Ligand SMILES: CCCCCCCCOCCOCCOCCOCCO
Ligand SMILES: CCCCCCCCOCCOCCOCCOCCO
């Protein structure tokens with residue numbers, strides 16, 4: 001007893017703009033200031049480094065313009081955080097240090113809305129295990145509602161990549177490189193999947 005469950009929404013930066021939804025459980029015990037948060041994040045992300053040279057001095061940013069290709073990227077991030085809340089702060093704001101584990105689903109690539117380049121779509125993917133650290137600030141606003149601030153940093157371990165090309169006839173090709181297969185180093189320099197991620201969000205938590 002008693003056990004305080006809230007749902008928390010936040011918006012802001014996670015390697016790109018996006019948001020998160022989470023459930024928090026706190027006051028898990030009479031004595032304890034332990035807290036647990038499970039959360040999911042969606043954010044935009046950049047998929048290929050514009051400054052990477054494929055030539056020649058010619059960069060992916062350069063050929064992107066030439067062929068009018070559309071780049072897109074995203075991260076979906078499942079996270080678990082253990083939070084601790086210091087007693088006799090003594091501040092008007094609650095600050096909880098937290099550490100946790102993450103699982104990220106990265107994906108992006110480009111489409112060929114035309115002209116040139118047969119015509120099609122190319123997509124790359126990586127699922128990574130991450131670790132991270134941060135602080136969560138909460139301020140009581142109204143009944144059952146607090147303002148929440150969150151700053152943290154996550155690190156992700158390099159994982160395999162999976163490429164899918166699709167032609168106009170609809171034919172599909174698939175492949176994957178691992179650490180450490182042949183062209184992995186190169187793929188990894190070019191593909192903008194997570195490594196270090198700054199997390200900076202504002203949001204609100206509703207109790208019950
Ligand atoms: C302030 C901590 C940063 C310290 C690390 C040095 C430079 C960090 O860049 C490393 C590359 O990390 C790539 C993550 O990019 C942001 C996430 O969004 C794109 C990935 O999907
Ligand atoms: C939060 C503390 C964790 C300590 C991090 C130490 C890192 C040592 O192992 C690094 C292994 O990860 C390989 C890096 O992956 C390549 C990233 O480049 C991505 C761009 O495509």
Ligand SMILES: [Ca+2]
Pocket residue numbers: 046047048049050071
């Ligand atoms: Ca880019």
